[PDB]
Design a protein around this ligand. Structure first.
Ligand code: SF4
Ligand code: SF4
Ligand code: FES
Ligand code: FES
Lengths: 633, 633
């Protein structure tokens, strides 16, 4: 089972699923082999009903699509649609939060409110919305209206791009025509330009893709901004992760998906219903997190993380998961089928994300508390049904220190330098105590033994004094393997990095260091890493493509992650990807994405499937940046 | 060559291409065989990097996608993305026209103007925009702003749906939650809901698809509305079609693509440059049309149609095509490669639609006349280069009477009944002289011998007194085979239909009948057929799903055509499709689309690859409607 996952709790549940005959994502992967090589290489097109068209990577016919689409056109068009689909997910998330904020401050959903007034005001100032002599409710109404206006063409470009990146970066992007005009506008233009008989130039296609990836960045940043206003900016918290956070004697309720608009309500309502759960025979309601909704409530509330991504079915296999509350994105639909064997009540809540065989509860922000009670009562019924069953919860968990929003990181640094909080970090970059910064982002992928790339690359970077931050299921992988426990700083971190984590931690009263890896939140919270890197760029007076900062989507799967990797490249970062996207069928497209895009944005993709080699390549990229700043390395 | 195309001029050029070694769309199709069955059946998914996933239609594993996506989920998700991509094309077209109208009435593009003031005012009244005591330029500014507002969420739903369909139809759709909230909003929501780990219920997925198809209908209707304002509502015109409209001794310039914003300028500027062309040794500039841009200028100006769709390369093979002026959609990118052998200058003009190896001319509405002159001068240079070459223009063409906008049809009918123009048509439906109405729409497809389905079905319907209207390449197919020549009414039409076409034609002073088939314009002008059918519904006081009206996308290929067929079903029409979309891999999805959608919208797909059988099925559908109205059949 260790070829399937490096997580020992997941291995234990894979053994249980096997002897009980429950098919898993790994079984379904095995049943798919060998996978189609045309699709793997990107040389397949189904964009019209003359298709499907394919192109042999090498040899004889077919060499070209029926309409004349070349290999480079077909590869670029498919990649562009992946970017647009990812942008559509992150921006649908953000749009939903914008409507929730609008409802809240218009008196239509009393369960929701302005919880972070400081964040609201700083966002308004960044957008140029006036605060002086304005009610908060009117400032917030203005912010929500500005968020919704960024989805369509207007007199300004997308402000959640142009106001969040350094001005020099905005100028470089504008010179290449890469600034998005509207989030949904760009998504639609990609789908238009990639349809049959439209754009057929690989460079032109990919430039459109870079612009659409910035529409995705805008959605990520909008989502983080609005969620912080509504639910609070994260601050450092201590919790636990992995399957051992389930409790056989409680009602175990997983919040799963990405948008925390209801799951944040579940967290607060679940506390209210403790006595109702105790009457059922439970100690209470044990809310646990899966995937990014789990990351959201871990970040703000210290809700323990149960599992992530590829291993999500395993939480059900314990037999102790009484409910799984779903919104959308990265939910394996298999969970609706597995629930028939495990007893779990799977509940969908979003109109546009239903799963056949799961129970649907129409959630409305206007009725959020009532909805949460109905949902939790289904969970309590399920707990009662399994009175007197044995469960197998692996006795495996890690300690997780998290909550490192960019505001929290700046506050932590401010204890070393009150009026110049970024300077102690730059100081230690300059003197070599911090070699650089690497963001781990993205998913797990059944093709990669779970967490193997994240942990293997992270161990090598930390030994070389790289400051490592993480989001999404990259944060999930690192947290489940102890990388967010400060007790492991001695084992994991080089001396220079240990010195810095220790100095910051001790100045924040901890008597101990910051954790080896800083958890900066969910997938949309990749925008937080942008905010930190942009602040560093502005303080140093250079663009992002001169900073010793890299990203690694070490095990990515989702179209969302393809979008994130593309905007990481677009804003100027060397961006490692540890699974092949469908690009190997076109050498010209691969060369643009790995080499010549350097001349446009300064970032570039680093394709490397071997994690040890990837770490060497990421260090090389960091050190080349150091050399370009005239620093030793 | 008759297995490839039923058009004799195309056959002649296929022989020329063969002996000169020029590869055609039919050659590239042959080189694709056998095509992938997973893609043909819809049982393939590449929506994440754990893919590609496939499902065996029958037999053993794989039976399910790696994430657990079932066959019905995978089929529905792929179909939904096809609909969204089509909506993105039609609405990008309409958006471009909305910005052009806005520029024109704000003094920024003097080449453009309000040419149809009556249409502008009637649109404003339909939208509830006040006209009394308003300048035209302000009414138009308001109309363009309303058009742009329909692309995003606002206080109203998409008005180019709710104000163009009968109120009873809007109520039925609203009850099922099918009214679009914003055009690009729906496109993005489809791409979100279909991404990995999101919507996984086939019925839910397809309901989203129906709503997105209405976003496409809105784009079509907006495009027709704005083009009529800017360039004039079509009225009956006489011209010619097929390759013989090229002239060896003129500068032959093809306008090709869909959006006529520049091609309408080409038409007027080309006249201005006659003397400049004569100095080159040409008789003048011979502008000809390909695909829907060709249909636009045929409809408004009587520009002869050269060819359509699948056979577009053949116009180049003549050796006489001096320039091909492209905007976007349905342009085979092969044309850029063929031009190296045929001498044609291929010119792209739209930023998001470039083709490698073609010359690009940045077109701006602000500089449209200057751009047109640069483009036509490249064409005149090309004509000079082929002085003293032999060309092979097939001496084959048909007479085409066209220009049947809905306003023109109502005006023609008004000569029989001034205050009640629709009543003479309904009268003849009731008494059986007109059995019903069939709209032919959509593309040609290399899988179907060119025009064979359109002509075979049309001949049978016309003999059975069906009133036949056509758009796009369905109009192209019928016009190239003589179906728009009134001289063929005796041969083609049943006695009842002949009587009606004759009575209308004679009352409009013609001394002869209307043509056997009424050409209602381009693909977006399918909205004109909706306007006519909606007017008939309102005059009869019934919904569209009670009218004896059907549609046939007899040879369709483009994602745009999939969207059109889906909204034809959604507004209540029996809708024949003559090529299989990728749905046969899911019986539940096929049953929804061919049977149970009747219970939601009253329309339904009729899948029939055999054209003789399709005509029998379309007649059966028409006659069932007649019976439901208590009419003889
Ligand atoms: S768009 Fe071109 S390459 Fe794609 S399926 Fe259609 S004919 Fe084939
Ligand atoms: S979304 Fe599911 S079915 Fe599609 S490629 Fe990914 S794992 Fe396979
Ligand atoms: S041929 Fe397998 S992905 Fe299309
Ligand atoms: S397996 Fe051929 S279309 Fe994917």
């Amino acid at each position: 089972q260790n070829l399937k996952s490096t997580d020992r709790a997941v291995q234990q549940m894979l053994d249980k699923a096997k002897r009980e005959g429950i098919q898993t994502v790994w079984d379904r992967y095995e049943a798919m082999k060998p996978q189609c090589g045309f699709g793997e290489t990107g040389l397949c097109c189904r964009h019209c009903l003359q298709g499907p068209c394919r192109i042999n990577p090498f040899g004889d016919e077919p060499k070209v699509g029926i309409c004349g689409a070349t290999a480079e056109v077909i590869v670029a068009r498919g990649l562009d649609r992946s970017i647009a689909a990812g942008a559509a997910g992150h921006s649908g998330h953000a749009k939903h939060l914008a409507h929730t904020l609008k409802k809240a401050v218009q008196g239509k959903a009393a369960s929701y409110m302005i919880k972070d007034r400081t964040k609201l005001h700083s966002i308004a100032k960044r957008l140029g919305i006036p605060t002086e002599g304005q009610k908060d409710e009117d400032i917030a109404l203005e912010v929500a209206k500005a968020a919704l206006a960024d989805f369509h063409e207007k007199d300004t470009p997308v402000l959640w791009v142009t106001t969040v990146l350094p001005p020099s970066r905005v100028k470089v992007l504008s010179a290449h025509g890469l600034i998005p005009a509207g989030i949904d506008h760009e998504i639609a233009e990609i789908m238009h330009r990639t349809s049959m008989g439209c754009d057929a130039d690989a460079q032109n296609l990919l430039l459109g893709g870079l612009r659409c990836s910035l529409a995705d960045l805008a959605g990520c940043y909008m989502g983080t901004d609005l969620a912080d206003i509504l639910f609070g900016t994260p601050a450092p918290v201590v919790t636990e992760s992995n399957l051992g956070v389930l409790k056989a004697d409680a009602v175990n309720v997983a919040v799963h998906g990405h948008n925390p608009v209801l799951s944040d309500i579940i967290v607060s309502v679940s506390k209210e219903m403790e006595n109702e759960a105790r009457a059922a025979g439970a100690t209470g309601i044990n809310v646990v997190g899966i995937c990014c909704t789990g990351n959201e409530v871990l970040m703000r509330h210290g809700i323990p993380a149960c599992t992530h991504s590829v291993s999500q079915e395993m939480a059900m296999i314990t037999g102790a998961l009484d409910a799984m509350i779903l919104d959308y994105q990265c939910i394996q639909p298999s969970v609706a089928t597995i629930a028939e064997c495990t007893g779990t009540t799977v509940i969908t809540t979003m109109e546009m994300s239903k799963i056949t065989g799961a129970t649907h509860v129409n959630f409305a922000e206007e009725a959020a508390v009532e909805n949460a009670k109905q949902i939790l009562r289904l969970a309590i019924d399920t707990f009662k049904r399994r009175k007197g069953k044995p469960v197998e919860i692996p006795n495996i968990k890690t300690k997780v220190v998290a909550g490192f929003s960019t505001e929290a990181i700046i506050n932590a640094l401010s204890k070393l330098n009150a009026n110049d909080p970024l300077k102690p970090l730059i100081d230690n970059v300059v003197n070599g105590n911090i070699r650089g910064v690497c963001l781990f982002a993205g998913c797990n992928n059944v093709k990669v033994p779970q967490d193997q790339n994240f942990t293997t690359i992270a161990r090598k970077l930390l030994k070389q004094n790289v400051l490592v931050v993480a989001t999404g299921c990259g944060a999930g992988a690192l947290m489940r393997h102890g990388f967010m426990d400060p007790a492991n700083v001695d084992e994991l971190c080089g001396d220079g990095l240990k010195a810095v984590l220790t100095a910051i931690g001790e100045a924040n009263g901890l008597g101990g260091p910051l954790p080896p890896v800083l958890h900066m939140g969910s997938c949309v919270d990749n925008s937080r890493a942008v905010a930190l890197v942009a602040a560093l760029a502005n303080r140093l007076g250079v663009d992002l493509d001169r900073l010793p900062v890299v990203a690694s989507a070490a095990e990515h799967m989702h179209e969302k992650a393809v979008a994130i990797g593309t905007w990481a490249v677009t804003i100027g970062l060397p961006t490692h990807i540890g699974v092949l996207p469908p690009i190997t069928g076109s050498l010209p497209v691969t060369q643009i994405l790995t080499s010549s895009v350097k001349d446009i944005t300064g970032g570039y993709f680093i394709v490397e499937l071997d994690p040890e080699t990837a770490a060497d390549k990421l260090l090389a990229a960091i050190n080349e940046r150091r050399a370009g700043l005239g620093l030793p390395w």
